[PDB]
């Protein structure tokens, strides 16, 4: 069997079901074999960076059940993937990257030249620091096992991206078809700490939410009445609930941060407790609590926040080994969770009442109007992203998606293409004016493929998050996003008022379809709450619930 | 002195005079220090990839006399630079890259974690394989000497890109100001080469990328012309060579039929800084210049005795060669006039429109560019695809004109942002030619052209296809072109230009093209032309591979 046909077969048999590409000579055999088999849907995009973001959104939107694929040619194709690869690496989402390479006999090998073949570039050397596995196939007999290995590595433990570099001659070669075809005492210790806490709280992180069994385990936590907060990456997958206080940290809800600083036991499930979660005083994190941290990765234990008790456990195993129903029922906790609900009621409010359009009002309207609609949100990077992270309260079949660790602007629009294809559901993008520019060209794909993606551009005529902290502001100069959308054949609307916003959103939900909204937000250049001056996480600005 | 202020001073004192950035928290101190000194002009762009291509165009448009700078924040800023870095690496153009990093005490170091600080990413590890020098500053006392070293390394020998990664705390540190202020050539080899030239009946030069940006090249070429010796060039050499009766054009797969004829009939080929890669020689390097003895001069031992094994190979840096060897010391051979007349005639009869049955001939479009811009100082920037090779073949540069290609890397999306750098540093109008595919990648930088009122004409040759690959798929996959052709579906480039506030025009005919060019040349200003070219999906001549370079198709 032809090697490229074997690659197509292996991808489809291992749940790599959606791929994204910009073509080049060195991947024609792969693309052709994939399209012919027709089990993996391959979508053409205008920039391999866009392809990489779309591919990453496949595992994101399917909660790691299905993997994405990005294909690129050697040289500039491979170098164009890199931002996306790095996002998958820093947020631990699985994704497959295949680069086509020049013929093995055209490689420079060890010769002291910068390149030998046309458009030759070693992609492995570029991505070794940001992948779980990166290898260039040397002989056609390595291809099948190495691809199977790479896919297994992407998915396993702490997930992430993998890359195989495949010389064109190997793609065309024949392969052999026949050869193709925890301590119970630790668990108990944690239970006992939970049982005896007067004010327990979970911190749900990125390591928890995409691990098998998570939502069923959380249902049992709710049955026991234990409240919780989440990191940005945990928050992506958590439905709104009275026991869920929202995201913690610098931009987190005042209520979530209050809970963290007043709990007597904090159980941290797969969170790095990085500077965005803790602020500049990790010593002060959960100051009234004993902290338990569970993580698969020893290096992420005893790091910034030194937990009182640290356990190296993979979380899907933890969830199958520990039912929260084994925690004795405790009615002391009702007073605590009532206290937190009331804190949320009184502090989860509009802090932008003197702005022309409040971000809190916009996101409150999204929460309300989409209550019975299965859709996901994709966020870009900037103040706009944090407006969303704070205020989005996800309804039953809704997730939101962020570039958290890397924080790459330009993620959202192309990611929405992948999310829509793999999630088979409408998508709402929120992006800022700066971030919208980077992969604006992929609006063409949204139009071409008639995808039900609503793109909301929150235009504050500034690179807002850095402007607050010459190179971020141009005296009100801005691009015409409504006109850019229309130029790309996407129905577009200028949104000046809450009525216009609400009407446009209703229209989209009634008849999902390519739509772009340019929201005029010149006075909206900060987040409230926010954390300043090295302060504790329960001292967000504006001061005192400000 | 504040470290970032020192960095600003050092850049300006070493001819790093134009920079391009997308801001981030970890480069605010560097950007502020640069703007406050005001000797290096820093221009904001929408994508660090665009910034990188723009920065690269600074040395390109100034023939390596002035260097460009791209600044980016750690993490996605740095990863967005990479395509531009790789272009500078494979085409050997000098350029400085500075990335701002998290505070030294927030780095992950050797801890087994993927990151520690917010947006922390090791940029050095990403670019070590595609730079001459890449280093992360560890102590503020290293910054000044390392930056000076990096700039030196970028410029020297075979040029290229360098990167320094600078932690924010180091940018804010004090440095000591007072301290801030504080093989051989053989004559016998030169003579041997002179003797080979003087006794050749049919001499030819191959002028490569290593020659044309080396100091003294144009004055040396003037003397070659005085002696009446003809020459061809690689794509990278062709960037900088003025049209002349002795210059037969670019050689190779897409080169002129006349240039390829000259190479295969000369009796001595003197190769000056060319790799003689597959695009120059085709698939039979053993047949390259079959009637000639070949002399190759290169700085890099690894690029000698490589694909084409020269009869005589010399490791010499070309600026030294050009000073050590005046072509005036070659005696004229009396057979040369017959040979150069033969080649001029070959050029006359073969440098011809091969697309007479197309609605718009690329050859006609580029010959109109040659004619209409005859007395105008401007540069061309090309993207990647059939459109790029139409330009490489047919452009005949007038006196103060150059063209610029992504040759080794061949990165689509180069042209539009490169034009921004070229325009700023070259202080001259720029004409971009890009295909419909290539135009998309960094389309967002049209906004910068409009914002800054730059005299850049963007010509989109829209054949509704990813043409150069579409042909590959026709010939080898039985017409299965779903990833290069979408049944005529296309973007509206005229409307996209207008949306970005760039005056735009649809161009259907040669008259419209000519009128629009005349308008641009009369009043240079942001302008976009969408040229409708649905039937234009191949290059002629081309090499259908395996064949010798003098049997291009169509035959
Ligand atoms: C502009 C901006 C502002 C931000 N503001 C905030 C903010 O205010 N608050 C906030 O929370 N974030 C914020 N972020 C996001 C932040 O940078 C981090 O991306 C995020 O907080 C990390 O979440 P995490 O540690 O839960 O998940 P990850 O980064 O995914 O870390 C996962 C952790 O769990 C472990 N793990 C993974 N899989 C498993 C498994 N199977 N079993 C066991 N352990 C596992 C890993 O080893 C690691 O320790 C911001 C980002 C940006 C760009
Ligand atoms: C779509 C496409 C089609 C192409 N078609 C063609 C084609 O038809 N014909 C063609 O010619 N190219 C073609 N190219 C370009 C090709 O890929 C190479 O980029 C090009 O041929 C390299 O030219 P070069 O070797 O002269 O320059 P470089 O790649 O820059 O190599 C420079 C050489 O000179 C040496 N050198 C550098 N500086 C010095 C110095 N100071 N002193 C001494 N030696 C020095 C280097 O060591 C090296 O060997 C194409 C590219 C693309 C993207
Ligand atoms: C590729 C990249 N370069 C730079 C940054 C740094 N940065 C963080 S937020 C931000 C501003 C984003 O502005 P915009 O998209 O308009 O959003 P706003 O903050 O205004 O809502 C920038 C430049 C980034 N995250 N990604
Ligand atoms: C970034 C990048 N990805 C992929 C390729 C491979 N490739 C070479 S030419 C080409 C098609 C170019 O299409 P277009 O820009 O429309 O030019 P045309 O050949 O049709 O004139 C592609 C995809 C490339 N060179 N650069
Ligand atoms: Mg903004
Ligand atoms: Mg095209």
From TrEMBL, chain B:
- Keywords assigned by UniProt? FAD, Flavoprotein, Metal-binding, Nucleotide-binding, Thiamine pyrophosphate
**Binding sites annotated in the UniProt record for FAD:** 209, 234-235, 251, 254, 275, 277, 280, 298, 317-318, 407
Record-level Gene Ontology MF annotations? acetolactate synthase activity; flavin adenine dinucleotide binding; magnesium ion binding; thiamine pyrophosphate binding
- Name recorded for this polypeptide: Acetolactate synthase II, large subunit
One BP annotation, GO: isoleucine biosynthetic process
Q: Which organism is it from?
A: Pseudomonas fluorescens (strain ATCC BAA-477 / NRRL B-23932 / Pf-5)
Question: Where along this sequence does the record place binding of thiamine diphosphate?
Answer: 386-387, 410, 412, 437-438, 463, 467-468
According to its UniProt record, which protein family does this protein belong to? Answer: Belongs to the TPP enzyme family.
């Amino acid at each position: 069997m032809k090697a490229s046909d074997a690659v197509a077969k292996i991808l489809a048999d291992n749940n790599v079901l959606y791929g994204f590409e910009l073509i080049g000579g060195m991947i024609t055999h792969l693309v052709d074999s994939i399209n012919l088999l027709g089990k993996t849907k391959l979508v053409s995009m205008h920039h391999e960076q866009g392809a990489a973001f779309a591919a990453s959104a496949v595992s994101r939107v399917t909660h790691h059940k299905t993997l994405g694929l990005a294909l690129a040619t050697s040289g500039p194709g491979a170098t164009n993937l890199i931002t996306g690869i790095a996002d998958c690496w820093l947020d631990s989402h699985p994704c497959i990257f295949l680069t086509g390479q020049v013929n093995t006999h055209e490689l420079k090998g060890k010769r002291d030249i910068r390149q030998q073949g046309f458009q030759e570039l070693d992609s492995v050397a570029l991505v070794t620091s940001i992948t779980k596995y990166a290898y260039q196939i040397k002989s056609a007999d390595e291809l099948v096992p190495c691809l199977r290995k790479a896919i297994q590595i992407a998915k396993e433990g702490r997930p992430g991206p993998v890359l195989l570099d495949i010389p064109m001659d190997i793609q065309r070669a024949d392969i052999d078809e026949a050869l193709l075809n925890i301590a119970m005492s630790d668990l108990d210790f944690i239970i006992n700490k939970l049982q005896n806490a007067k004010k327990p709280l979970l911190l749900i992180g990125g390591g928890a939410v995409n691990s098998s069994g998570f939502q069923k385990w959380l249902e049992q936590i709710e049955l026991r009445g234990i409240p919780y907060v989440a990191s940005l990456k945990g928050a992506e997958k958590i439905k709104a609930s009275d026991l869920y206080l929202g995201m913690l940290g610098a931009y987190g809800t005042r209520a979530a941060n209050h809970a963290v600083q007043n709990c007597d036991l904090l159980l941290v499930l797969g969170s790095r407790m990085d500077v965005r979660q803790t602020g500049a005083q990790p010593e002060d994190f959960a100051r009234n609590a004993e902290i338990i941290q569970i993580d698969l990765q020893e290096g992420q234990l005893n790091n910034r926040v030194i937990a009182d008790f640290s356990y190296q456990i993979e979380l899907s195993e933890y969830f199958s080994r520990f039912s929260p129903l084994q925690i004795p029922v405790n009615n002391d906790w009702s007073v605590w969770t009532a206290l937190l609900k009331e804190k949320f009621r009184v502090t989860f409010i509009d802090e932008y009442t003197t702005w022309n359009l409040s971000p809190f009002g916009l996101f409150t309207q999204l929460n309300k109007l989409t209550e019975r609609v299965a859709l996901d949100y994709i966020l870009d990077v900037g103040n706009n992203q944090m407006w969303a992270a704070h205020t989005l309260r996800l309804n039953a079949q809704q997730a939101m998606h962020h570039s958290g660790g890397l924080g790459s602007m330009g993620f959202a629009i192309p990611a929405a293409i992948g999310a829509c294809y793999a999630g088979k559901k409408p998508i709402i993008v929120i992006t800022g004016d700066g971030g919208a520019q980077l992969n604006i060209q992929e609006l063409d794909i949204i139009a071409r493929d008639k995808l039900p993606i609503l793109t909301i551009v929150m235009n504050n005529h500034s690179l807002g998050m850095v402007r607050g902290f010459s190179s971020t502001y141009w005296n009100g100069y801005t691009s015409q996003f409504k006109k850019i959308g229309e130029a790309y054949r996407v129905e577009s609307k200028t949104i000046i008022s809450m009525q216009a916003f609400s009407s446009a959103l209703e229209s989209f939900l009634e008849s999902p379809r390519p739509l772009l909204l340019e929201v005029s937000m010149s006075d909206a250049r900060e987040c409230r709450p926010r954390l300043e001056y090295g302060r504790a996480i329960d001292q967000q600005s504006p001061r005192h619930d400000g």
